[PDB]
Amino acid sequence: EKLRLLLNDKDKKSFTDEELNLFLEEADCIYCAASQGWILKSLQYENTVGEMYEYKVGQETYKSSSIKDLVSVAYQNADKFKDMCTNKKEKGSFMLGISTEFE
C-alpha cells in the first residue's frame, strides 16, 4: 500500500492521509512524494520543537537539538529521496544513428 509505505518513508503520524494521497498525485514515483513530504514536515519543526532548544529549570536541564539541526537533517533526507528517485528513473548515455533522405 502506497499510504503505509509513505508513512514509513516519510516518518509517521504527523500528517493525515488525504494530503498523503495528494502528494502521491503530485508525482507517481513514491520517493519524490516522500521528499516533498520531508520538506513540508521540516516546516513543522517550528511547532513540535520551538526555537527554545535548551532550558534549565529547578534541577533539570534539557538540551534539544536546535531547529537548524533538525531542519537541516530533514532537508538532507529530502535530498537523499530526490537522489534515489533520480537514480530510479535515470538511464545512461548511448550512441544512435542519423538518417537522411537523398535522391
Add this chain to the structure above:
Amino acid sequence: GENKRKAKVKQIITAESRFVEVEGDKIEGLEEGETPNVWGFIPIIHFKNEADETLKYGQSDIEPIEPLLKAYHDVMLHALKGS
C-alpha cells in the same frame, strides 16, 4: 481500331526449317506450325562480345567494372548524406 491483343509467341529457328507457335490472340503475318527454310543454315548470327572458350555466351564490357560502380555509388551517396 481499339482492341487490346496479347500473345505469348515462341518459335524454334533451325537450319532446315523453323517451327513457330503462338499462345493467345491471332498474329496475321505469322503462319503457325512449321515452315521450310529456304536454305540449309540458320540465318541468325550470334555476335559474342568478349567471347571465351570457357563461355557459351558473350560478355558485356560493364561486367568487370560494375563492382567498382557499386563502390563509387556507395561512397558518393554516403558523402552526400553526410554533407
